[PDB]
Amino acid sequence: NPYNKLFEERIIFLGVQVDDASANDIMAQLLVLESLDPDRDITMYINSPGGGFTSLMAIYDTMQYVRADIQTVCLGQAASAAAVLLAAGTPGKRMALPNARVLIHQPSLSGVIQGQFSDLEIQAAEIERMRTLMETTLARHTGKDAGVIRKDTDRDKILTAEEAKDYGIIDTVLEYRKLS
Amino acid sequence: NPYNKLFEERIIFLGVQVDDASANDIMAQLLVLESLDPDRDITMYINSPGGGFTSLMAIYDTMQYVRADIQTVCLGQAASAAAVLLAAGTPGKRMALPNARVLIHQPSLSGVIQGQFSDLEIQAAEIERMRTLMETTLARHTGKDAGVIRKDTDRDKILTAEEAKDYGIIDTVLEYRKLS
Amino acid sequence: NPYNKLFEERIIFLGVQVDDASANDIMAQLLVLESLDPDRDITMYINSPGGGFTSLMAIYDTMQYVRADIQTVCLGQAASAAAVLLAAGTPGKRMALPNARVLIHQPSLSGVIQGQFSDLEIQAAEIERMRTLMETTLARHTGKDAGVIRKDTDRDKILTAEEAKDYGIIDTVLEYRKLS
Amino acid sequence: NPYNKLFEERIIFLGVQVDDASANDIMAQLLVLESLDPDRDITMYINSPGGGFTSLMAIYDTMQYVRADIQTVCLGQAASAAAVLLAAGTPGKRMALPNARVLIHQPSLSGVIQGQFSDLEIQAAEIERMRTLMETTLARHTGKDAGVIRKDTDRDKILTAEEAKDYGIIDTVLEYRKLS
Amino acid sequence: NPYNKLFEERIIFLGVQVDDASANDIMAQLLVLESLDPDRDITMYINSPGGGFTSLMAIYDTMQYVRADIQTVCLGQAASAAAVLLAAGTPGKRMALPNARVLIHQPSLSGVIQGQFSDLEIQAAEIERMRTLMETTLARHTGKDAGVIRKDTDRDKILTAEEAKDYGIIDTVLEYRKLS
Amino acid sequence: NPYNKLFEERIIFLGVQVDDASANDIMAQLLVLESLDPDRDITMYINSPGGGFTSLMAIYDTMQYVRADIQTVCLGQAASAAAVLLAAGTPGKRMALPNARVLIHQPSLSGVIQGQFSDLEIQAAEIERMRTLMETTLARHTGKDAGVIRKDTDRDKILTAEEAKDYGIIDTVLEYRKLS
Amino acid sequence: NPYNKLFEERIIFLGVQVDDASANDIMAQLLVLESLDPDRDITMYINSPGGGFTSLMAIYDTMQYVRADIQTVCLGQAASAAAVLLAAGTPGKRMALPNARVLIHQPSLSGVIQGQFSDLEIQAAEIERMRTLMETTLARHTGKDAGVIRKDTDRDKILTAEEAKDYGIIDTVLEYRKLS
Amino acid sequence: EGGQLTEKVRRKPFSVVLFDAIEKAHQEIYNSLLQVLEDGRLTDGQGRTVDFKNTVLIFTSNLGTSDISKPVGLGFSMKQKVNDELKKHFRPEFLNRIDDIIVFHQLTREEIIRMVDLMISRVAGQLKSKDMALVLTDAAKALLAKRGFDPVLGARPLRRTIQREIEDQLSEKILFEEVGPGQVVTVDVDNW
Ligand SMILES: CC(C)C[C@H](NC(=O)[C@H](Cc1ccccc1)NC(=O)c1cnccn1)B(O)O
Ligand SMILES: CC(C)C[C@H](NC(=O)[C@H](Cc1ccccc1)NC(=O)c1cnccn1)B(O)O
Numbered sequence A, B, C, D, E, F, G: 001n002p003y004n005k006l007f008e009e010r011i012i013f014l015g016v017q018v019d020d021a022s023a024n025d026i027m028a029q030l031l032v033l034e035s036l037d038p039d040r041d042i043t044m045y046i047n048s049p050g051g052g053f054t055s056l057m058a059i060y061d062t063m064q065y066v067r068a069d070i071q072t073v074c075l076g077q078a079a080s081a082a083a084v085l086l087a088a089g090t091p092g093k094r095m096a097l098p099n100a101r102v103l104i105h106q107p108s109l110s111g112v113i114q115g116q117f118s119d120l121e122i123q124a125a126e127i128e129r130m131r132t133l134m135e136t137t138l139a140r141h142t143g144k145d146a147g148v149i150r151k152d153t154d155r156d157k158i159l160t161a162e163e164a165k166d167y168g169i170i171d172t173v174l175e176y177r178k179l180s
Numbered sequence H: 001e002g003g004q005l006t007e008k009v010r011r012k013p014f015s016v017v018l019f020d021a022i023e024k025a026h027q028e029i030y031n032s033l034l035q036v037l038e039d040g041r042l043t044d045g046q047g048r049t050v051d052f053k054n055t056v057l058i059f060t061s062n063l064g065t066s067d068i069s070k071p072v073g074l075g076f077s078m079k080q081k082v083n084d085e086l087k088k089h090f091r092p093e094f095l096n097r098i099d100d101i102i103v104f105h106q107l108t109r110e111e112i113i114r115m116v117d118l119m120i121s122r123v124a125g126q127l128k129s130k131d132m133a134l135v136l137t138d139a140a141k142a143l144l145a146k147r148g149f150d151p152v153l154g155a156r157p158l159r160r161t162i163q164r165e166i167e168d169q170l171s172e173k174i175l176f177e178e179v180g181p182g183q184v185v186t187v188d189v190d191n192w
């Protein structure tokens, strides 16, 4: 079973939309591979369209918690929450495939949430500290000034893997091994 | 199977929306780990958006019933009922990841319930004693005056884990272990 | 598997909405635990929102049929039929967690049923003998006069576990084993 | 698994709405228990809301076909087709729990079926011989005159188990065995 | 498992609506029981509401193909295609339970199919040769003149099992065996 | 399991609507039976309503690719794609049951596809070369002139198995083998 | 199980719509077959309608990453992403069945995405670099000038396998092996 | 061979049988070992009464490796961890006939250097047979405790640490030909 043999070789496969249930699976997998061998590097494969900030920071804190280095590899897409998880790998071990896409953009409410203006001053203060935390996280891991990331994630910033390396999202664009 | 290996290492994973079926699973898991070793600490991982008051107080009473200490760890979110379950851990063992979110707010009727005004004076007296019980519970576990919590949970009070420690929801913000 | 280990330790877990399929599971479980050891007490955990009268009286008669004493424990909710099943435990063995809710109310048609007035005089005579049977059942098990219960279940009567003890629904509010 | 242990102890559990698929399961179970021991009594537990006439007469003929006596036990509800299956047990072995409900009523088209009047003279001749067959079946098993049952099943006739014994639907109201 | 023990005792259970997937299962079962013992009689239990003509003639040709005699037993219903499959058993081995219903009626388009009149002259020539083939099949197996069956299946012809014997659909109404 | 025992005796069962997933299963089955014994004849049972042209030509090319002869047997229906797959068997081994239906008709767009007229000149040139390829394929396997098939598949041409033999779709109408 | 025996013989079966979940399965399968034998050729069967560009470039980069040569075989359809994955095989090992269809067309937004014009200048710059990357990829693998492919994939360019060989999508049209 | 318990335990009724790594075995293996905890007798495949009557049977399982595997676990953060691993892995029919369950703890550094003292004195008797003398120092003994111990396997490869780190360099004496009447050698490798 190919997902088991990834996990037996210490590869957590993100794969899907980052929601609660996807975040719950990875934190279960980050801690088991922490307990199996805390000194051997966990690899995290990311092909996710992102989504979720509390699901982001659940995966983010757990992959920062564990003793093992997290090797983040972007496969075809790391958008929103997933590009932050892509930068969340340990320095020197953040990888991307050459035609992978890194999409960084400020947090967004999917759909309108109603309420009184006192309720909405708090839901707006929440997405503002969701925004600053997304930028403070992405500044620790890209080496930028977090106001630069606010200017850059003002809109959808699609990064090619070669220019996600220059941005600091990843550290290495993966070279091919076709023995041919 | 990573949820089995959490449960074999005495970790109950809340994970989903607190409803009846989620509450039914945890009380089944709180009592089995009570029967396996009542002197060894049950750990409860919380990534829940909350919901449900009778499902809250089903999980709450069961994790207060068992002989084992409950180590509550907030992963990315403890909104609504889940933040009460997060405070429901034993003192000194209430943990949160650094970018976890604690959201405390008064009980709310999801959707309108119709009825005569005599029916609605009782559904309002119910959510009032749902509100006082949410505040009396959260005052036993945070050390606040329960009128302070009424002022604080008047609206949605989002707590960062560092200021959920100051509020008394959790006792320790979890430090990272990456060998680094 | 935590529901198996409840059932191996003779704990029937009600958990969900009392309908036909939930009633069918419990009667299958009440009679197996009757056949495994008819002199050892079956424990029934109740976290149900109720519903169903023929599903109520299917569970009710079966837990009254079996040789084993039924220990009813209310977890977070015993509403409508489930509060009748909560009183249906043997005297001295009806328990509730301290923040469990007991909700007793007269039977109700969920949704309108159409028909001729001769058809509706019978559907109203049915819910009237559903009402008297709910009150005659709850008077055998609470020690009240069954006209008192008609006055009390005229509307939704929410009972806290300490005042479901005074009402006679339960016999013991469960004390904790961790003092927090 | 509690439904397996019912079936290993020769108890067919009706449980759900009598439709084709429910009728198909019971006839599969009536004939297997016929082949396992044709001289040992099959017990049929009935908690069904009824429905279906060809599904009724599929279950009815099969439980009349087999060499084994059918012990019909009404749990909380034996409505329509299920009350006919409840009377379909062998004489002396038709049981009901004390608060079980027996609901006998004439066959009915669920929803309108359209067609020409020649098509509808046949669909009405069908439900008329559905009606006479329901009354001829219920007269063989209750000892009534089949015109008495036509007068009685003119509307919905709810029978309590004590007055389903007097009607002839069941033969014994089950006494409780709580050793107390 | 009661459907396996039917099939191990060479009983194919039709049971459901004759569609493609139901026809595909029976032809898989008719040929396996042909290969297990081609000289031992396959029994076909029919409780079907019919439907499908190409699914009919898939089951029909396969149960006519195999070396084994097909014992068709009508349980509670054989309608449309299923009554043709009921007559499709070998002569002398076509059985019906006493309150089983046999419903023969001409083929019908479920729902309107649109098209040009040249398209509809062919869809009408198709259901006409569906109609003649249904009558030619049912005349080989009932011994009628196939114009008699056209007069009889002009509308829905419900046959009781005693008058499906007189019609030639079945050969024996099954007598009961309850030792009683 | 009757589909396994078909496949163990080298019988691929088409059965359902020819779509991608049905075509994917058969090509997986055509090549495994090619690898198990490439000199022993694969039998293909066809009860399909057709559909799909790229799914047709996926099954068609694979059953033409393999070393094994494909014995196509039409059960009750071979419409559209299925009838082309029915003719796709090896000559002398194309069989049909006597009341099987062969329906040949030109390719058709299920539902409207929108677009600019330059987009629609290509979707019409596609279904034109879908049409010529359906006729060129069906002329290699029926021995007709491919303009004759264009005249014949102008509308829905339903073939009885005896006149699908005369058309060249099949080579043998299967005679019955009931020992009778 | 025929998909297992494809994978045990190192055949990855694309089969379905290229989306995230289909891309996630193939990259799991491309790397396992890389780890089982990196010097033995992986075969990729393509019957896909395409879709997805980040799912394309996830499969594309992984099949370019692995040490094993990828033998791409088009079965009945290689449309959109699939046709790029079909050209993504190693030179000399790109195969197609004779009636397989290769459909190359520029990237397209399925459905409208809303937003401000600054948001839409970026979603249009994205599909423009999706378009150039689709053409730069398909020029490395077909030997064309990437402006020729822009002229050719301006609309839907359906290629027959014999003229997908001339286009450079595949290298060999597969000859049949039916011993005949 | 196999069925050799005749030549062992009814040859020696007073014996000690050690079952190393019993958690690796199959269930059916110790279903035949349920006899010898109840009765004290065993039926051989050649039909012998192999008495385990006076034999101290000792089973062995490193069912504990969690803390062993670094001071981290499966959580977000000893003796009873490996006790409930026996209950998880084995059948309670097998465990309760056993007299006492003995659990070992991680060795303190003061506990390891006494084992170093016991085992450096084992080779020291073979040195004064040739009138050589390893002049003992405690600085080298602390480094043997660091190198010859890990919390997965430790105090078993301590003796290979002695022969690789001491006895390799004491062969360098006669490589440069030091015999004499006796050479008072003192060795100390660098600090880690
Ligand atoms: C860049 C990081 C912060 C993640 C981004 N945030 C979001 O917009 C998503 C939006 C979303 C996704 C799925 C379901 C519900 C809501 N993350 C959130 O949960 C969210 C919620 N409120 C405000 C901001 N973000 B991205 O859009 O995923
Ligand atoms: C700490 C908790 C009590 C605060 C919040 N509670 C609620 O708003 C929840 C949300 C909810 C769930 C089901 C049905 C209706 C409403 N309130 C209740 O549990 C509830 C249930 N019935 C009546 C009144 N309130 B949160 O959503 O959990």
Ligand SMILES: CC(C)C[C@H](NC(=O)[C@H](Cc1ccccc1)NC(=O)c1cnccn1)B(O)O
Residues within 6 Å of the ligand: C049, C050, C051, C052, C053, C054, C056, C079, C080, C081, C082, C084, C105, C106, C107, C108, C109, C110, C127, C130, C134
């Ligand atoms: C107190 C006992 C009698 C149970 C109560 N009676 C009922 O209204 C329930 C109906 C119900 C309620 C909620 C969800 C689903 C079904 N019991 C019945 O089946 C019922 C049916 N007809 C009339 C009255 N009650 B309670 O509302 O469940």
Ligand SMILES: CC(C)C[C@H](NC(=O)[C@H](Cc1ccccc1)NC(=O)c1cnccn1)B(O)O
Residues within 6 Å of the ligand: D049, D050, D051, D052, D053, D054, D056, D079, D080, D081, D082, D084, D104, D105, D106, D107, D108, D109, D110, D127, D130, D134
């Ligand atoms: C008392 C016995 C006869 C059972 C009763 N029979 C019925 O009313 C049932 C209800 C029903 C079920 C399915 C479809 C249409 C109608 N009657 C029938 O089975 C039925 C089916 N087709 C035509 C006419 N009546 B009861 O309502 O279940």
Ligand SMILES: CC(C)C[C@H](NC(=O)[C@H](Cc1ccccc1)NC(=O)c1cnccn1)B(O)O
Residues within 6 Å of the ligand: E050, E051, E052, E053, E054, E056, E079, E080, E081, E084, E105, E106, E107, E108, E109, E110, E127, E130, E134
């Ligand atoms: C009596 C035998 C011939 C079968 C009877 N005939 C029918 O009414 C059935 C009902 C039906 C099923 C599927 C799709 C459309 C219509 N007629 C057909 O089999 C049928 C199928 N396709 C076209 C035309 N008629 B039965 O199914 O009612």
Ligand SMILES: CC(C)C[C@H](NC(=O)[C@H](Cc1ccccc1)NC(=O)c1cnccn1)B(O)O
Residues within 6 Å of the ligand: F050, F051, F052, F053, F054, F055, F056, F079, F080, F081, F082, F084, F104, F105, F106, F107, F108, F109, F110, F127, F130, F134
């Ligand atoms: C005999 C050969 C041509 C198969 C024929 N199939 C088609 O016409 C099918 C059309 C279809 C059928 C069912 C569901 C969806 C699409 N061929 C196609 O896949 C197709 C696809 N795009 C354009 C045109 N046809 B059959 O319907 O005649």
Ligand SMILES: CC(C)C[C@H](NC(=O)[C@H](Cc1ccccc1)NC(=O)c1cnccn1)B(O)O
Residues within 6 Å of the ligand: G050, G051, G052, G053, G054, G056, G079, G080, G081, G084, G105, G106, G107, G108, G109, G110, G111, G127, G130, G134
């Ligand atoms: C060759 C590659 C581009 C695959 C092509 N697939 C597409 O057209 C797909 C269809 C699609 C899906 C989701 C959202 C928007 C569009 N294109 C994309 O993957 C895509 C995704 N986001 C923006 C723009 N295009 B195929 O249809 O040509």
